[PDB]
Design a protein around this ligand. Structure first.
Ligand SMILES: OC[C@H]1O[C@H](O[C@@H]2[C@@H](O)[C@@H](O)O[C@H](CO)[C@@H]2O)[C@H](O)[C@@H](O)[C@H]1O
Ligand SMILES: OC[C@H]1O[C@H](O[C@@H]2[C@@H](O)[C@@H](O)O[C@H](CO)[C@@H]2O)[C@H](O)[C@@H](O)[C@H]1O
Ligand SMILES: OC[C@H]1O[C@H](O[C@@H]2[C@@H](O)[C@H](O)O[C@H](CO)[C@@H]2O)[C@H](O)[C@@H](O)[C@H]1O
Ligand SMILES: OC[C@H]1O[C@H](O[C@@H]2[C@@H](O)[C@H](O)O[C@H](CO)[C@@H]2O)[C@H](O)[C@@H](O)[C@H]1O
Lengths: 721, 721
């Protein structure tokens, strides 16, 4: 049985194959167990209470009880625990609180923080409600833990109520924390950089504090809101992993602290940097949702658990199991230099090769002839489009293609009518020059007038035009915070910006629910689970190099389903890397993702056109396997590997893609073994017609043969008989 | 003072900054110290003698003296030492010997084993002669250790005399052995493969036995006769290294054994595999020369020590400091498909770009139109050469080029007149079919008639033709050993083959000492210090890819001077790797070696011709710096590095070559610091005219800037003012 149970002083939060067991000890909440299901928990792994030097106590006479040494589910500073705190509220002359458990409730079905992205499809869930109070400060903190009956994930968030007669200020308020017992641990995170997104990083947990964080106002290219605490020696196939993740797209921190006793604290939430939150009497603050996910089946186990939870409970139901259109995007194809003739000719070529959707990228609005002006001016450039957008769309529709359109609503150019009319709408500090980034500024979405304006302009665009798809961009990070009437309002504006964004995108995605919205932030600059609540695919990276895409796709699909992961076949030499790669390899690499095209089809040879038509035909066949199937990493593209290989299973279809980076000589061929087949199953390999048992493919494997050369690839396609 | 000293029961072998101190303990020889100079040695690091269980004793009553636990300089089996032995002689019913020290002598000046390559320029050397006897077996073993006054190297070899009235058989006889005290050690070796020669390998010394060996009858592509025993944590710049090397080109073994007490034995010599040696009464056997070289300046220290010793005492004096000609070789250019017109046209183009030497590769002799016939038939194909070789050579000379010629004297084709006349000259076993390799057979150079024939044919070729250069090839390994009249003669034939080879090549190189002989064995299949005694350069690898050449050159110049290391600019796509690389990078990579050219100059554009002419002009300038200067590795090309950088210093000239393998994006530029400059020196960088102090270049370093793209390179050229 799954759900929530209250049994004497234990609370059991029971998801599928994952339990959190909390003990109420005289108002203090102790983490007894987080991990595989245990019923009738007795306490075999309880903390041994002893006098630990310099670890102090809530009472004078009992030296062996200390919040410095108890395992907890939230952290305070000032009561004897010196580990990093996760709740810290200023009230009167102090930022000491002492929240004590008073009452527990259980909810059933949907719930979550208002104004923030949270799980859906929650009918078969229960939520533990732990009501804590600080009687002196007259504050309440309420913790929520939600079970899921179909996934090894628990969701968490909290609400802080000010029940006092004075203003209070939240300084720290994370979404999840767990104290894990001293043991050897490794951590996996996804970091990297622009054009190197979601680089998989693994390291040993060491004494001290390790953290990843964004202070950019977006989660960022260089860190993902995820931290995987792993059993020493974890592999793809074996060992315990706990993934903590955050459904938030602004400033966040994830940290792991190893203290003086070798104990380990992990937490994730809103970054303390650039954050404070004023609460007037009777006001409350709810944190974004955190997730804790578990597998005992290594890193592939955690990928599957995380992907499944995302597909079922985050990504929009309307799209989570819907094959996504193969698109053409004109950006790398033309940049800003296009007009109607060029567009329809590209559309003609796209239709001939069987592409499904035509996306008009940057440059269609205002006087956007380059990237130095016009953001904020969402007026159609009818001169450039050679008539109305309506007439363009009709043209695209009549050629048999869906129509998509680029927006960047959060941004404003100094050189724009919007800025001329409302210069105060930009994020800025009185008496300081702007800081520029791609020669543009960020709109203050903490300003309700800004949100109202964007809802209006965009609702107008979407209702008056037959648009099938939106690409929602965001091309710089936030500087010069000073739009508040007070310092505290400025400290709130980064989170209020996010609330404004979510109000905006939840409104539009809900009001226009037939439209496929793809998120973007110079590629993967905001590829997190907050955005994926509303945008069921993401432009994974501006780097469209087939080879540079290998580690990027590795990371981008590590916790997120492949279906989310936009990938385009682009021109050579590649625009980012300056590299020639075979068209075959560009195709096979993009086909490990959500396939599209981004090159000038009108300038290709007849042969290159035929190749792309063949690629499109192939992917129409593989699309369900890739987008709806189960992903298995076989060879990981990292810093030292010269190879990449990824398998997908879906019913009677099994495919495997193999890529080799550098040509090798006098080196024995790799043996590549498949996973998760029926030993007794019979698998017919398309290329040679041979039938192999699943046992053979899994335990003997394929001798991988290639010619001489860099960046070569091949694909194996099997049908189970 | 350096040289040899005998002081009571200590013998001191004293080279520059390296001493071997041996103690005579009642006929047993103990290794007291090998390492930095110590005078007046007292024995601070003596073995503590105790009863070690299962370590037995030469006398009944003294359980604390055991050859199982004493550090020694040669190893026997059967007297209580169970570490791997380095001398083992069968006599009568046993292969137990008990060699006991009887007498020491000191020689001055040159000496070495007859018939085997050994150091030259030995006027300032002394040799310790340790005469050992086994009175029962009536055998003598004499050990030789030679000092050098200008290098931290000691040379060693031994002679075994049969003074008995019966035949005896040597089963094991290594050239050097040392027992090192228990400590943490790493080892560096050079292994790899064909087209991947001299791959630098580093690992921890572990309990048990690690070895590299050849049983191929040549030292081989996959292992070099070298083993570096290193202090834990050695770097390029710091820590103790002991390099043991062998001046031999046949079957060898190097091993490191960590025993039950954590002690470490290292040895190098003739491989026991495929070796036995019969001695009739009064006959003797001398082993090849081993070298032990030391540095306390890390791996660059050992490179310098090894290179210096090779330049001064191995490589021919006639060439060791002589700039080597920039050559054109036609092999990759035409393969077998050439005639006189094509040759002279290539020669014309070579002259225009300033090339100095023209080498005619395979296919000029017998009916060698492919690689399936004619080896053994060293008759000029006057039809193919369009007249006599004499007339061809005159033509090449008149165009201003030296002339070079390809030979493979050790080999015979089934389809050849030589085989038709003397089928028994091939290495073979009566009643077994041939084993084939590149469809050719190996000549039995253990057969004195074979050696006489080759001396004659080749002396004739060289005296009747004005040849400036020879490329001496050897394109397969030895199979089917059975040419002996007895089993024992067969067991001797692999070493006798080597003696035959050395007799042949010492004769020809001496009799034709103006000719530059470059050794070759499908590239680096026999690139060892035995060959380098007679052949002052070597074709480092058939792999002429600029990028694949990086780890190859790293290894090929690790212990051997750059001047030895043949490197050719070749065509793209590269014939081995199937890869396009910039001509600039092919040039800069080959210029880190001994530069030549190997592509069809007649088929290049006018631009590619101008580029090569520029490369030749440049290298004429850099040649002394590269060939005669001091080499400093700055970034090593290994399995994980994406970079390579090598510096050369020579008087007032400092150059640095940098190569990046894969294009990178959003990655901060590398900072490359130079080494071994004068802090106060002023260094003018050619490209920008800026003057930097040596301190700046060494301690701040160069920000390395590149455009986008794979396989890019650049060079920095400095002049000290
Ligand atoms: O749910 C826990 C809290 O409940 C009460 O306040 C809530 C407030 O948080 C918000 O949900 O608005 C509703 C509307 O009725 C309630 O006022 C308590 O005041 C808090 O102390 C806390 O228990
Ligand atoms: O040099 C040590 C040996 O000297 C004597 O033999 C040598 C022999 O090795 C070889 O060098 O030929 C010369 C020619 O006179 C000598 O015979 C002893 O017979 C050996 O026992 C050994 O001492
Ligand atoms: O402007 C259209 C373009 O926007 C985003 O990419 C850009 C990139 O082209 C430019 O070079 O840099 C900025 C940041 O400096 C952005 O990354 C989209 O990601 C891209 O797909 C395209 O739509
Ligand atoms: O035959 C001339 C050729 O000999 C050696 O190379 C060859 C190589 O070309 C061929 O492909 O393989 C055999 C072994 O199978 C040899 O490696 C020389 O090294 C080369 O320079 C050339 O002279």
């Amino acid at each position: 049985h799954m759900g929530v149970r209250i049994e004497n002083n234990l609370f059991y939060v029971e998801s599928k194959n994952l339990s959190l067991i909390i003990e109420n000890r005289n108002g203090y909440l102790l983490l007894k167990h987080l991990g595989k299901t245990i019923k009738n928990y007795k306490g075999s792994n309880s903390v041994y209470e002893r006098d630990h030097a310099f670890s102090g106590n809530p009472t004078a006479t009992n030296r062996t009880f200390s919040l410095d040494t108890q395992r907890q589910i939230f952290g305070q500073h000032g009561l004897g625990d010196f580990r990093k705190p996760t709740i810290q509220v200023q009230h009167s002359v102090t930022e000491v609180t002492d929240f004590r458990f008073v009452e527990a409730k259980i909810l059933k079905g949907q719930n979550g923080p208002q104004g923030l992205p949270s799980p859906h499809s929650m009918d078969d869930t229960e939520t533990l409600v732990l009501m804590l109070e600080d009687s002196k400060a007259q504050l309440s903190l309420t913790l929520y833990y939600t079970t899921f009956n179909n996934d090894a994930t628990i969701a968490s968030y909290s609400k802080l109520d000010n029940n006092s007669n004075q203003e209070v200020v939240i300084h720290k308020d994370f979404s999840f924390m767990a104290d894990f017992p001293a043991a050897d641990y490794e951590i996996v995170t996804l970091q990297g950089a622009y054009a190197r997104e979601k680089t998989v990083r693994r390291q040993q947990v060491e004494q001290g504090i390790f953290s990843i964080s964004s202070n950019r106002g977006a989660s960022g290219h260089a860190q993902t809101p995820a931290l995987l605490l792993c059993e020493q020696g974890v592999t793809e196939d074996a060992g315990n992993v706990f993934a903590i993740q955050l459904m938030y797209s602004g400033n966040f921190e994830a940290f792991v602290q190893k203290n003086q006793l070798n104990e380990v604290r992990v937490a994730i939430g809103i970054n303390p940097e650039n954050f404070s939150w004023k609460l007037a009497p009777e006001e409350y603050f709810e944190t974004p949702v955190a997730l804790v996910t578990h597998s005992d089946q290594g890193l592939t186990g955690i990928s599957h658990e995380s992907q499944n939870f995302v597909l079922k409970h985050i990504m929009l139901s309307e799209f989570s199991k819907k094959e996504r259109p193969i698109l053409i995007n004109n950006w790398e194809a033309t940049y800003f230099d296009f007009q109607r003739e060029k567009l329809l000719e590209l559309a003609d070529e796209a239709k001939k090769v069987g592409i499904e959707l035509f996306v008009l990228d940057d440059g269609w609005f205002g006087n956007r002839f380059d990237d130095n002006r016009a953001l904020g001016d969402w007026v159609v450039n009818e001169e450039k489009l050679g008539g109305s957008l309506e007439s363009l769309i009709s043209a695209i529709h009549e050629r048999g293609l869906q129509f998509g359109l680029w927006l960047e609503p959060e941004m404003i150019s100094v050189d724009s009518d919007l800025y001329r009319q409302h210069p105060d709408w930009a994020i800025q500090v009185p008496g300081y020059e702007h800081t520029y980034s791609r020669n543009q500024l960020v709109l203050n979405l903490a300003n309700p007038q800004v949100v109202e304006y964007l809802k209006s302009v965009l609702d107008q665009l979407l209702f008056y035009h037959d648009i099938d798809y939106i690409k929602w961009n965001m091309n710089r990070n936030i500087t010069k915070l000073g739009n508040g009437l007070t310092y505290l309002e400025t400290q709130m504006q980064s989170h209020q910006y996010m609330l404004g964004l979510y109000e905006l995108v939840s409104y539009l995605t809900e009001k226009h629910s037939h439209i496929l919205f793809e998120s973007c932030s110079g590629g993967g600059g905001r590829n997190d689970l907050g955005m994926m609540r509303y945008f069921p695919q993401v432009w994974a990276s501006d780097n469209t190099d087939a080879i540079a895409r290998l580690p990027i796709q590795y990371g981008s699909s590590y916790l997120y389903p492949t279906i989310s992961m936009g990938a385009h076949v682009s021109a050579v030499p590649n625009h980012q890397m300056g590299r020639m790669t075979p068209l075959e390899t560009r195709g096979l690499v993009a086909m490990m993702g959500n396939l599209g095209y981004e090159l000038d089809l009108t300038n290709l040879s007849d042969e290159e056109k035929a190749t792309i038509a063949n690629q499109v035909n192939l992917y129409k066949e593989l699309r369900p396997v890739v987008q709806l199937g189960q992903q298995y990493r076989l060879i990981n593209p990292d810093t030292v590997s010269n190879e990449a290989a990824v398998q997908f299973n879906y019913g009677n279809q099994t495919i495997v893609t193999y890529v080799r980076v550098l040509s090798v000589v006098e080196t024995m061929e790799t043996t590549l073994k498949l996973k998760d087949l029926d030993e007794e199953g019979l698998y017919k390999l398309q290329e040679n017609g041979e039938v192999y048992s699943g046992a053979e493919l899994m335990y003997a494997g394929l001798t991988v043969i290639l010619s001489q050369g860099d960046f070569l690839s091949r694909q194996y396609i099997f049908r189970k008989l």
